[PDB]
Coordinates of C-alpha atoms and ligand atoms in Angstrom, one line a residue:
Chain X
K1 CA 7.1 51.9 48.2
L2 CA 7.6 48.4 46.6
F3 CA 7.8 49.8 43.0
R4 CA 10.0 52.2 41.2
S5 CA 7.7 54.5 39.2
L6 CA 8.4 56.0 35.8
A7 CA 6.4 58.7 34.1
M8 CA 6.1 58.1 30.4
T9 CA 3.8 60.9 29.2
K10 CA 5.0 62.0 25.7
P11 CA 6.2 59.2 23.4
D12 CA 8.7 60.0 20.6
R13 CA 6.3 59.6 17.8
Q14 CA 8.5 61.2 15.1
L15 CA 11.4 58.8 15.7
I16 CA 9.1 55.8 15.8
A17 CA 7.5 56.8 12.5
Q18 CA 10.9 57.5 10.9
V19 CA 12.5 54.2 11.9
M20 CA 9.4 52.0 11.3
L21 CA 9.0 53.5 7.8
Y22 CA 12.7 53.0 7.1
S23 CA 12.4 49.4 8.0
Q24 CA 9.4 48.7 5.8
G25 CA 11.3 49.8 2.7
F26 CA 10.3 53.4 2.3
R27 CA 13.1 55.4 0.8
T28 CA 11.6 58.8 1.7
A29 CA 11.0 57.6 5.3
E30 CA 12.5 60.8 6.8
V31 CA 10.3 63.1 4.7
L32 CA 7.3 60.8 5.1
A33 CA 7.6 60.8 8.9
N34 CA 8.3 64.5 9.0
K35 CA 5.1 65.0 7.1
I36 CA 2.9 62.4 8.8
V37 CA 3.5 63.1 12.5
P38 CA 2.7 66.9 12.2
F39 CA -0.3 65.8 10.1
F40 CA -1.6 63.8 13.0
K41 CA -0.9 66.8 15.3
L42 CA -2.9 69.0 12.9
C43 CA -5.7 66.4 12.8
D44 CA -5.9 66.4 16.6
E45 CA -5.9 70.2 17.0
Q46 CA -7.7 71.4 13.8
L47 CA -10.7 69.1 13.5
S48 CA -13.9 69.4 15.5
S49 CA -13.7 67.9 19.0
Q50 CA -15.6 64.6 19.1
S51 CA -15.8 61.8 21.7
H52 CA -14.9 59.2 19.1
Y53 CA -11.7 60.8 17.8
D54 CA -8.3 59.3 18.5
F55 CA -5.0 60.6 17.0
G56 CA -2.5 59.0 19.5
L57 CA 0.3 56.6 19.0
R58 CA -2.0 53.7 18.4
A59 CA -3.5 55.5 15.4
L60 CA -0.1 56.3 13.9
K61 CA 1.1 52.7 14.4
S62 CA -2.0 51.3 12.7
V63 CA -1.5 53.8 9.8
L64 CA 2.1 52.9 9.3
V65 CA 1.4 49.1 9.5
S66 CA -1.3 49.6 6.9
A67 CA 1.1 51.6 4.8
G68 CA 3.6 48.8 4.8
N69 CA 0.9 46.3 3.8
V70 CA -0.4 48.6 1.1
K71 CA 3.1 49.1 -0.3
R72 CA 3.6 45.3 -0.3
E73 CA 0.3 44.7 -2.1
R74 CA 1.0 47.5 -4.7
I75 CA 4.4 45.9 -5.5
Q76 CA 2.7 42.6 -5.9
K77 CA 0.0 44.1 -8.2
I78 CA 2.7 45.9 -10.2
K79 CA 4.6 42.6 -10.7
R80 CA 1.4 40.8 -11.7
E81 CA 0.4 43.4 -14.2
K82 CA 3.9 43.7 -15.7
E83 CA 4.2 39.9 -16.1
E84 CA 0.9 39.7 -18.1
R85 CA 1.9 42.9 -20.1
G86 CA 5.5 41.9 -20.8
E87 CA 8.8 40.8 -19.2
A88 CA 10.6 43.7 -17.5
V89 CA 10.2 42.9 -13.8
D90 CA 13.1 43.9 -11.6
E91 CA 13.0 45.1 -8.0
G92 CA 15.1 48.2 -8.5
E93 CA 12.9 50.2 -10.9
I94 CA 9.7 48.9 -9.1
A95 CA 11.0 50.3 -5.8
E96 CA 12.2 53.5 -7.5
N97 CA 9.0 54.0 -9.6
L98 CA 6.6 53.7 -6.7
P99 CA 4.4 56.5 -5.2
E100 CA 5.2 56.1 -1.5
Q101 CA 3.3 59.4 -0.7
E102 CA 0.2 58.1 -2.4
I103 CA 0.5 54.8 -0.4
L104 CA 0.7 56.8 2.8
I105 CA -2.2 59.0 1.9
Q106 CA -4.3 55.9 0.9
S107 CA -3.6 54.3 4.3
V108 CA -4.4 57.5 6.2
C109 CA -7.7 57.9 4.3
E110 CA -8.7 54.2 4.8
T111 CA -8.1 54.4 8.5
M112 CA -9.3 58.0 9.4
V113 CA -12.1 58.8 7.0
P114 CA -14.7 56.3 8.5
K115 CA -14.3 58.0 11.9
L116 CA -14.9 61.5 10.6
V117 CA -18.2 63.5 10.9
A118 CA -19.6 64.9 7.7
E119 CA -18.3 68.4 8.1
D120 CA -14.7 67.3 9.0
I121 CA -14.0 65.5 5.8
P122 CA -13.3 68.7 3.7
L123 CA -11.0 69.8 6.6
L124 CA -9.2 66.5 6.5
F125 CA -8.7 66.7 2.7
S126 CA -7.6 70.3 2.9
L127 CA -5.0 69.3 5.5
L128 CA -3.9 66.4 3.4
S129 CA -3.4 68.8 0.4
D130 CA -1.5 71.3 2.5
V131 CA 0.9 68.7 4.0
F132 CA 1.0 66.4 0.9
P133 CA 0.5 68.7 -2.1
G134 CA -0.6 67.2 -5.4
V135 CA -1.3 63.7 -3.9
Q136 CA -4.9 62.5 -4.4
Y137 CA -6.8 59.6 -2.9
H138 CA -8.7 57.3 -5.2
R139 CA -10.4 54.4 -3.3
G140 CA -10.6 51.1 -5.2
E141 CA -14.1 50.3 -6.3
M142 CA -15.0 46.7 -5.2
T143 CA -17.3 45.5 -8.0
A144 CA -18.1 42.0 -6.7
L145 CA -18.6 43.2 -3.1
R146 CA -21.0 46.0 -4.4
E147 CA -22.9 43.4 -6.5
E148 CA -23.3 41.1 -3.4
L149 CA -24.4 44.1 -1.3
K150 CA -27.0 45.0 -3.9
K151 CA -28.3 41.4 -4.1
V152 CA -28.5 41.2 -0.3
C153 CA -30.3 44.5 -0.1
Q154 CA -32.8 43.4 -2.7
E155 CA -33.3 40.1 -0.8
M156 CA -33.9 41.8 2.6
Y157 CA -35.9 44.8 1.2
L158 CA -33.0 47.3 1.7
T159 CA -32.5 50.4 -0.4
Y160 CA -29.2 49.8 -2.1
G161 CA -27.6 52.8 -3.8
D162 CA -24.4 54.1 -5.4
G163 CA -22.6 57.5 -5.6
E164 CA -25.0 60.3 -4.8
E165 CA -28.1 58.2 -5.3
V166 CA -30.5 57.5 -2.4
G167 CA -28.7 55.0 -0.2
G168 CA -25.2 55.9 -1.6
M169 CA -24.0 57.2 1.7
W170 CA -25.1 54.0 3.4
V171 CA -23.2 51.8 0.9
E172 CA -20.2 54.0 1.4
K173 CA -20.4 53.4 5.1
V174 CA -20.7 49.6 4.5
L175 CA -17.6 49.6 2.3
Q176 CA -15.7 51.7 4.9
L177 CA -16.8 49.3 7.6
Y178 CA -15.5 46.4 5.5
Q179 CA -12.1 48.1 5.0
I180 CA -11.8 48.7 8.8
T181 CA -12.9 45.1 9.4
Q182 CA -10.0 43.9 7.3
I183 CA -7.6 46.4 9.0
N184 CA -8.7 46.0 12.6
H185 CA -9.8 43.2 14.8
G186 CA -11.8 45.7 16.9
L187 CA -14.7 47.5 15.4
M188 CA -17.1 50.2 16.8
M189 CA -20.0 51.8 15.0
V190 CA -20.8 55.2 16.5
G191 CA -23.9 57.1 15.4
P192 CA -27.3 58.4 16.6
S193 CA -30.1 55.9 17.2
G194 CA -31.4 54.3 14.0
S195 CA -28.7 55.5 11.6
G196 CA -28.6 52.1 9.9
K197 CA -25.7 50.6 11.8
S198 CA -27.3 47.3 12.6
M199 CA -28.6 46.8 9.1
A200 CA -25.2 47.9 7.7
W201 CA -23.2 45.3 9.5
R202 CA -25.9 42.6 8.8
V203 CA -25.8 43.4 5.1
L204 CA -22.0 43.3 5.0
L205 CA -21.9 40.0 6.9
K206 CA -24.4 38.4 4.4
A207 CA -22.5 39.9 1.4
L208 CA -19.2 38.5 2.7
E209 CA -20.8 35.1 3.3
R210 CA -22.2 35.0 -0.3
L211 CA -18.9 36.3 -1.8
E212 CA -16.0 34.6 -0.1
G213 CA -17.9 31.3 0.5
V214 CA -17.3 31.3 4.3
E215 CA -20.5 31.8 6.2
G216 CA -20.7 34.3 9.0
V217 CA -22.2 33.8 12.4
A218 CA -22.9 36.8 14.5
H219 CA -23.4 36.7 18.3
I220 CA -25.2 39.8 19.6
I221 CA -24.6 40.7 23.3
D222 CA -26.1 43.5 25.3
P223 CA -23.3 44.2 27.8
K224 CA -25.4 46.4 30.1
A225 CA -28.5 44.2 30.1
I226 CA -26.7 41.8 32.5
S227 CA -24.3 42.3 35.4
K228 CA -20.6 42.2 34.7
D229 CA -20.4 38.9 36.6
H230 CA -22.8 37.3 34.2
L231 CA -21.0 38.9 31.2
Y232 CA -17.4 37.9 32.0
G233 CA -17.7 35.2 34.7
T234 CA -17.4 34.6 38.4
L235 CA -14.6 33.2 40.6
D236 CA -16.4 31.3 43.4
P237 CA -15.4 32.9 46.7
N238 CA -15.4 29.7 48.7
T239 CA -14.5 26.8 46.2
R240 CA -12.3 29.0 43.9
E241 CA -14.3 27.5 41.0
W242 CA -14.6 29.5 37.8
Chain V
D1 CA -64.2 48.3 36.0
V2 CA -66.8 50.8 34.9
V3 CA -65.6 53.4 32.4
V4 CA -67.5 56.6 31.6
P5 CA -66.9 57.2 27.9
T6 CA -65.2 60.5 26.9
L7 CA -63.7 62.1 23.8
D8 CA -60.1 61.5 25.1
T9 CA -61.2 58.1 26.4
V10 CA -62.5 56.8 23.1
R11 CA -59.6 58.3 21.1
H12 CA -57.1 56.6 23.4
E13 CA -59.1 53.4 23.1
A14 CA -58.8 53.5 19.4
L15 CA -55.1 54.3 19.4
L16 CA -54.3 51.6 22.0
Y17 CA -56.3 49.1 20.0
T18 CA -54.5 49.9 16.8
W19 CA -51.1 49.7 18.6
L20 CA -51.6 46.5 20.6
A21 CA -53.1 44.8 17.5
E22 CA -49.8 43.8 16.0
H23 CA -48.2 43.2 19.4
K24 CA -46.1 46.4 19.0
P25 CA -44.8 47.6 22.3
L26 CA -45.9 51.0 23.5
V27 CA -45.8 53.3 26.5
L28 CA -48.5 55.5 28.1
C29 CA -47.0 58.6 29.7
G30 CA -49.0 61.0 31.9
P31 CA -49.5 62.3 35.4
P32 CA -50.4 59.8 38.1
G33 CA -54.0 59.0 38.3
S34 CA -54.7 60.3 34.7
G35 CA -56.4 57.1 33.7
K36 CA -53.6 55.3 31.9
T37 CA -54.1 51.8 33.4
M38 CA -57.9 52.0 33.1
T39 CA -57.5 53.0 29.5
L40 CA -55.2 50.1 28.9
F41 CA -57.5 47.6 30.6
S42 CA -60.6 48.9 28.8
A43 CA -58.6 48.4 25.6
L44 CA -57.7 44.9 26.5
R45 CA -61.4 44.2 27.2
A46 CA -61.8 44.4 23.4
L47 CA -59.0 41.8 22.9
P48 CA -60.1 38.5 24.6
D49 CA -57.0 36.6 23.4
Chain M
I1 CA -77.2 29.0 24.1
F2 CA -74.4 31.6 24.4
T3 CA -75.2 33.8 21.3
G4 CA -79.0 33.6 21.3
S5 CA -79.7 34.4 25.0
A6 CA -78.7 38.0 25.9
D7 CA -79.1 37.5 29.7
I8 CA -76.2 35.0 29.9
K9 CA -73.6 37.7 29.2
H10 CA -74.9 39.7 32.1
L11 CA -75.2 36.6 34.3
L12 CA -72.3 34.4 33.2
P13 CA -69.5 36.8 32.0
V14 CA -66.2 35.0 32.4
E15 CA -67.4 31.7 30.9
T16 CA -69.0 33.7 28.1
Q17 CA -65.5 35.0 27.4
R18 CA -64.1 31.5 27.6
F19 CA -66.7 30.2 25.1
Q20 CA -66.0 33.1 22.8
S21 CA -62.3 32.2 22.8
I22 CA -63.1 28.5 22.2
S23 CA -65.4 29.5 19.4
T24 CA -62.7 31.7 17.7
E25 CA -60.2 28.8 17.9
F26 CA -62.8 26.3 16.6
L27 CA -63.8 28.6 13.7
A28 CA -60.1 29.2 12.8
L29 CA -59.4 25.4 12.8
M30 CA -62.5 24.6 10.7
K31 CA -61.8 27.4 8.3
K32 CA -58.4 25.7 7.8
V33 CA -60.5 22.6 7.2
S34 CA -62.8 24.4 4.8
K35 CA -60.1 25.7 2.5
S36 CA -58.7 22.2 2.2
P37 CA -61.7 19.8 2.5
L38 CA -59.5 16.8 1.6
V39 CA -59.5 14.2 4.3
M40 CA -55.7 13.7 4.3
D41 CA -55.0 17.5 4.3
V42 CA -57.1 17.8 7.4
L43 CA -55.3 14.8 8.9
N44 CA -52.0 16.5 8.1
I45 CA -52.8 19.7 10.0
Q46 CA -50.1 20.3 12.6
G47 CA -51.2 19.3 16.1
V48 CA -54.8 18.7 14.9
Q49 CA -55.6 15.7 17.2
Chain R
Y1 CA 14.9 50.5 30.3
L2 CA 17.3 52.3 32.6
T3 CA 14.7 52.9 35.3
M4 CA 13.2 49.4 35.0
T5 CA 16.6 47.7 35.2
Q6 CA 17.5 49.8 38.2
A7 CA 14.2 48.7 39.9
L8 CA 15.0 45.0 39.0
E9 CA 18.5 45.3 40.5
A10 CA 17.1 46.5 43.8
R11 CA 14.7 43.5 43.6
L12 CA 11.9 46.1 43.3
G13 CA 8.9 45.9 41.0
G14 CA 8.4 48.5 38.3
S15 CA 5.5 50.9 37.7
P16 CA 5.4 52.8 34.5
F17 CA 2.5 55.2 34.6
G18 CA 1.0 57.9 32.4
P19 CA -1.8 58.6 29.9
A20 CA -3.0 55.7 27.8
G21 CA -1.3 55.2 24.5
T22 CA 2.3 56.1 25.6
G23 CA 3.5 52.5 25.1
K24 CA 3.8 51.3 28.7
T25 CA 2.7 47.6 28.4
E26 CA 4.6 47.4 25.1
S27 CA 7.7 48.9 26.7
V28 CA 7.6 46.3 29.5
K29 CA 7.0 43.5 27.1
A30 CA 9.9 44.6 24.9
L31 CA 12.2 44.8 27.9
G32 CA 11.2 41.4 29.0
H33 CA 11.7 39.9 25.6
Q34 CA 15.1 41.7 25.4
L35 CA 16.2 39.7 28.5
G36 CA 14.6 36.5 27.1
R37 CA 11.9 36.4 29.9
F38 CA 8.4 34.9 29.7
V39 CA 6.1 38.0 30.0
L40 CA 2.4 37.5 30.8
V41 CA 0.1 40.4 30.4
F42 CA -2.9 40.6 32.8
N43 CA -5.8 43.0 32.4
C44 CA -6.6 43.6 36.0
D45 CA -10.0 44.5 37.4
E46 CA -12.0 44.6 40.7
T47 CA -12.4 40.8 40.5
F48 CA -8.6 40.2 41.1
Chain B
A1 CA -48.7 -12.8 -10.2
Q2 CA -52.5 -12.9 -10.8
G3 CA -53.1 -13.8 -7.1
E4 CA -51.1 -10.9 -5.6
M5 CA -53.0 -8.5 -7.9
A6 CA -55.9 -8.6 -5.4
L7 CA -53.7 -7.2 -2.6
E8 CA -52.1 -4.5 -4.8
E9 CA -55.6 -3.6 -6.2
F10 CA -56.9 -3.2 -2.7
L11 CA -54.0 -1.0 -1.9
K12 CA -54.6 1.1 -5.0
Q13 CA -58.3 1.3 -4.2
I14 CA -57.7 2.5 -0.7
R15 CA -55.1 5.0 -1.9
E16 CA -57.3 6.5 -4.5
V17 CA -60.4 6.7 -2.2
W18 CA -58.4 8.5 0.4
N19 CA -56.7 10.8 -2.1
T20 CA -60.2 11.7 -3.5
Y21 CA -62.4 11.6 -0.4
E22 CA -63.7 15.0 0.6
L23 CA -65.4 16.0 3.8
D24 CA -69.0 17.0 3.3
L25 CA -69.3 20.6 4.4
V26 CA -72.5 22.6 4.5
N27 CA -73.2 26.2 5.6
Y28 CA -74.6 26.8 9.1
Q29 CA -76.6 30.0 9.5
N30 CA -73.9 31.8 7.5
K31 CA -71.6 31.6 10.6
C32 CA -69.5 28.5 9.8
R33 CA -69.2 25.6 7.4
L34 CA -70.1 22.4 9.4
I35 CA -69.4 18.8 8.6
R36 CA -72.0 16.1 7.8
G37 CA -71.7 12.6 6.5
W38 CA -70.3 11.0 9.7
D39 CA -71.9 7.5 9.1
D40 CA -70.6 6.9 5.6
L41 CA -67.1 8.2 6.6
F42 CA -67.0 5.9 9.6
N43 CA -68.2 2.9 7.5
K44 CA -65.5 3.6 4.9
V45 CA -62.8 3.8 7.6
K46 CA -63.9 0.6 9.3
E47 CA -64.3 -1.4 6.1
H48 CA -60.9 -0.3 4.9
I49 CA -59.4 -1.4 8.2
Chain A
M1 CA -34.9 54.9 2.3
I2 CA -37.1 54.1 5.3
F3 CA -40.2 54.8 3.2
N4 CA -39.0 52.6 0.5
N5 CA -38.3 49.7 2.9
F6 CA -41.8 50.1 4.4
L7 CA -43.5 50.1 1.0
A8 CA -41.4 47.1 -0.1
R9 CA -42.3 45.1 3.1
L10 CA -46.0 46.1 2.6
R11 CA -45.9 44.8 -1.0
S12 CA -44.0 41.7 -0.1
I13 CA -44.9 40.3 3.3
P14 CA -48.5 39.4 4.0
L15 CA -49.8 40.6 7.3
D16 CA -51.5 37.2 8.0
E17 CA -48.2 35.3 7.6
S18 CA -53.5 36.3 -1.7
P19 CA -56.3 38.8 -1.1
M20 CA -54.4 40.3 1.9
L21 CA -51.3 40.9 -0.2
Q22 CA -53.4 42.4 -3.0
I23 CA -55.0 44.8 -0.5
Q24 CA -51.5 45.6 0.7
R25 CA -50.3 46.4 -2.9
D26 CA -53.3 48.6 -3.6
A27 CA -52.8 50.5 -0.3
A28 CA -49.1 50.9 -1.1
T29 CA -50.0 52.2 -4.5
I30 CA -52.4 54.8 -2.9
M31 CA -49.9 56.0 -0.3
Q32 CA -47.0 56.1 -2.7
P33 CA -47.2 59.8 -3.7
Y34 CA -47.4 60.8 -0.1
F35 CA -44.3 58.7 0.9
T36 CA -41.8 60.8 -1.0
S37 CA -39.2 63.4 -0.4
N38 CA -40.8 66.8 0.4
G39 CA -44.1 64.9 0.6
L40 CA -46.9 65.2 3.2
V41 CA -45.2 62.9 5.7
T42 CA -41.8 64.6 5.4
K43 CA -43.1 68.1 5.9
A44 CA -45.4 66.9 8.8
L45 CA -42.5 65.2 10.5
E46 CA -40.1 68.2 10.2
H47 CA -42.9 70.4 11.5
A48 CA -43.6 68.0 14.4
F49 CA -39.9 68.3 15.3
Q50 CA -40.6 71.9 16.1
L51 CA -43.3 71.1 18.6
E52 CA -42.8 70.2 22.3
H53 CA -43.4 66.6 23.4
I54 CA -43.5 64.8 26.8
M55 CA -40.5 62.7 25.8
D56 CA -37.7 63.5 23.4
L57 CA -38.9 63.1 19.8
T58 CA -37.2 60.4 17.7
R59 CA -38.0 60.1 14.0
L60 CA -38.1 56.3 13.9
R61 CA -40.6 56.2 16.8
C62 CA -43.1 58.2 14.8
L63 CA -42.3 56.3 11.6
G64 CA -42.8 52.9 13.3
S65 CA -46.0 53.9 14.9
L66 CA -47.3 55.2 11.6
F67 CA -46.3 52.0 9.8
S68 CA -48.0 49.9 12.6
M69 CA -51.3 51.7 12.4
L70 CA -51.2 51.7 8.5
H71 CA -50.8 47.9 8.8
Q72 CA -53.9 48.1 11.0
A73 CA -55.7 50.1 8.4
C74 CA -54.9 47.3 5.9
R75 CA -56.2 44.8 8.4
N76 CA -59.4 46.8 8.7
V77 CA -59.9 46.8 5.0
Chain Z
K1 CA -7.5 76.4 3.1
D2 CA -6.8 78.9 5.9
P3 CA -5.9 77.1 9.2
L4 CA -6.6 80.3 11.1
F5 CA -10.2 80.5 9.7
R6 CA -10.6 76.8 10.6
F7 CA -9.6 77.5 14.2
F8 CA -11.8 80.5 14.5
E9 CA -14.7 78.6 13.0
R10 CA -14.4 75.9 15.6
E11 CA -14.1 78.6 18.3
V12 CA -17.2 80.5 17.2
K13 CA -19.2 77.3 16.9
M14 CA -18.3 76.2 20.5
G15 CA -18.9 79.7 21.9
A16 CA -22.2 80.2 20.2
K17 CA -23.5 76.7 21.2
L18 CA -22.6 77.2 24.9
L19 CA -24.0 80.8 24.6
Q20 CA -27.6 79.7 23.7
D21 CA -27.2 76.9 26.2
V22 CA -26.5 79.3 29.1
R23 CA -29.0 81.9 27.9
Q24 CA -31.8 79.3 27.6
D25 CA -31.0 78.0 31.0
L26 CA -31.1 81.5 32.5
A27 CA -34.4 82.2 30.8
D28 CA -35.9 79.0 32.2
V29 CA -34.6 80.0 35.6
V30 CA -36.2 83.5 35.5
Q31 CA -39.5 82.0 34.3
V32 CA -39.4 79.6 37.2
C33 CA -38.7 82.3 39.7
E34 CA -41.7 84.3 38.4
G35 CA -43.9 81.2 38.8
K36 CA -44.7 81.1 35.1
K37 CA -43.4 77.5 34.5
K38 CA -43.0 74.4 36.6
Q39 CA -39.6 73.3 37.9
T40 CA -38.3 70.2 36.2
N41 CA -35.6 67.7 37.3
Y42 CA -33.0 69.4 35.2
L43 CA -34.3 72.8 36.4
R44 CA -34.3 71.5 40.0
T45 CA -30.7 70.5 39.7
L46 CA -29.8 73.9 38.0
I47 CA -31.5 75.9 40.7
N48 CA -30.1 73.9 43.6
Ligands
ATP1 N1 -30.2 51.0 3.8 C1 -31.4 51.0 4.3 N2 -32.4 51.1 3.4 C2 -33.7 51.0 3.9 N3 -34.1 50.9 5.2 C3 -33.1 50.8 6.0 C4 -31.7 50.9 5.7 N4 -30.9 50.7 6.8 C5 -31.8 50.7 7.8 N5 -33.1 50.7 7.4 C6 -34.3 50.6 8.2 O1 -34.3 51.8 9.0 C7 -34.3 51.5 10.4 C8 -32.9 51.7 10.9 O2 -32.6 50.6 11.8 P1 -31.1 50.0 12.0 O3 -31.1 48.9 12.9 O4 -30.6 49.7 10.6 O5 -30.3 51.3 12.5 P2 -29.3 51.5 13.7 O6 -28.5 52.8 13.5 O7 -28.4 50.3 13.8 O8 -30.2 51.5 15.0 P3 -30.0 51.6 16.5 O9 -28.6 51.8 16.9 O10 -31.0 52.7 17.0 O11 -30.5 50.2 17.0 C9 -34.9 50.1 10.4 O12 -36.3 50.0 10.4 C10 -34.3 49.4 9.2 O13 -35.1 48.4 8.7
ADP2 N1 -63.4 58.6 31.6 C1 -63.4 58.1 32.9 N2 -64.5 57.4 33.3 C2 -64.5 56.8 34.5 N3 -63.6 57.0 35.4 C3 -62.4 57.7 35.2 C4 -62.3 58.3 33.8 N4 -61.2 59.0 33.8 C5 -60.6 58.8 35.0 N5 -61.3 58.1 35.8 C6 -61.0 57.7 37.2 O1 -59.6 58.1 37.4 C7 -58.9 57.0 38.0 C8 -57.6 56.8 37.2 O2 -56.6 56.2 38.0 P1 -55.5 55.2 37.3 O3 -56.1 54.8 35.9 O4 -55.3 54.1 38.2 O5 -54.2 56.1 37.1 P2 -52.9 55.5 36.4 O6 -53.4 54.9 35.1 O7 -52.0 56.7 36.3 O8 -52.4 54.4 37.4 C9 -59.7 55.7 37.9 O9 -59.9 55.2 39.2 C10 -61.1 56.2 37.4 O10 -62.1 55.9 38.4
ADP3 N1 9.0 52.6 21.3 C1 8.0 52.2 20.5 N2 8.3 51.6 19.3 C2 7.3 51.1 18.5 N3 6.0 51.1 18.9 C3 5.6 51.7 20.1 C4 6.6 52.2 21.0 N4 5.9 52.7 22.0 C5 4.6 52.4 21.9 N5 4.4 51.8 20.7 C6 3.1 51.4 20.1 O1 2.0 52.0 20.8 C7 0.9 51.2 20.8 C8 0.1 51.2 22.1 O2 1.0 51.0 23.2 P1 0.5 50.4 24.6 O3 1.6 49.9 25.4 O4 -0.7 49.4 24.3 O5 -0.2 51.7 25.3 P2 -0.3 51.8 26.9 O6 1.0 52.5 27.2 O7 -1.5 52.7 27.1 O8 -0.4 50.4 27.3 C9 1.4 49.8 20.6 O9 0.8 49.2 19.5 C10 2.9 49.9 20.3 O10 3.2 49.2 19.1
MG4 MG1 -29.3 49.7 15.5
MG5 MG1 -1.4 49.3 28.6

């Protein structure tokens, strides 16, 4: 009786997407939102039901933030390549001659593909084709990171691969995990026991250490091996000491 | 302490010895009273360290 | 005394095991000595004294 | 905003509820920042 | 210079003796490789001290 | 991939801490044709998955036990 | 490319999976009732 309660059940996702794509500089923000929100609805109610699937407002917000970042970095790259190729850089044509739909699809793939099970990927790509016809996704190929991964795998007796070769899927998962590590400050690796998760993140950490020059320290905690009091802390009932 | 040798007994002795040799952890599963702990102890009698 | 006499294992079991462990440790250490008979290398064995 | 300000006027606390991901904590923080208030978010548990 | 050569020569002699001195090992019943030559080793150590 | 990692560790890390490593390389050379796709081990494992076990059957449990006792075989040699 | 086929494919997968689940459980039950097989913890829970 001391609080006034309000039920907020169904957020206005379409308006949020519209406005927050309009603000970031997307000229087709209305069409982009009208295509992306129903796409998320379709992903929720067309793909196989898994305990590790989320298509709520948090996912859409992350997608649009990544879309803004990707548009910014593509504009930067276009400016850099034009400067070294000539002198014709002006904001108007760069903004006009920019594939916003490709940027959105790239962000959607980068954030949603790693979570998908094997058989759902064709469904996702078919949905993307249906909602965004003609647009294709071409992930950048990180040469230096792949070389560091191969060196670390050789050092630790791991089977590095590429493409369809033996170990190619594992390297794909490592690259996807790196992308999600850049995008998110919270990571989770779901998969049956002994699917390569531990070795995947260890190899990625070592590769990042050898590549960027900043060395990585990993603290491994078993949350359920200790009581929650020993995991987070205790407030002393008598002395109020933490 | 006395162990009457048996086909199953000697086979399990060999397998327990080859598993505990590198200090690899292992589990003996079976009905109660089957002889799991006696098999384990007779295997350790071959490893004085 | 321990190896030659066969009755001692029957009559003195636990200290037979103890001497066996001591003998294995002694043999390992003096094998380390044997592969490097140099005086200083033996002196440089970790925790030798 | 209307409901929360009505609660504030009556000197009553506010309780936005619903399924996770509907923007409840963010809505409260946005309202607090709109009025220029210092908003602290606490992740409560059984130890509180 | 010529006088101090005695001390440096003693140091070099001790260093080379202890870099080339080898423990005398002989087989023992094909079980181990035991050490002999205790007296000469002890005499060398005490004379160098 | 697991077979490759096992063989690489056998050919690289001595079990003592070299004749031991030479024995390891020879044994790895001998078991190489069996440790392959559609090999003896793979078919045996996929067949064992069809049998009933006291506990749930996990591939890595069997693989680790196999690698352990193969290391013991090298120790025996 | 047919969304209808995708939906029906999910539906048939789920239905078939739960179908062999229920049929296998009932087969275990009828074997237990005939005394053929021992009653396990999962079987104990299912019977109770
Ligand atoms: N890319 C790889 N190439 C070769 N061997 C690998 C590779 N990744 C993992 N392994 C090996 O296969 C096994 C898988 O263990 P790993 O810790 O990587 O998996 P996981 O999915 O994190 O395991 P879990 O969650 O069960 O602890 C280990 O023995 C590891 O050495
Ligand atoms: N091969 C055997 N030789 C001699 N005794 C045996 C043999 N197999 C079983 N036993 C007897 O069965 C008993 C096994 O009980 P125990 O090993 O304590 O069961 P658990 O290992 O489940 O605790 C022992 O007391 C032992 O006397
Ligand atoms: N009106 C809105 N405008 C922009 N973003 C919103 C809005 N409502 C919710 N969000 C986004 O939804 C995400 C999750 O909201 P949050 O308040 O954490 O969920 P919950 O209601 O479960 O606490 C936040 O990152 C926030 O940016
Ligand atoms: Mg793991
Ligand atoms: Mg919240």
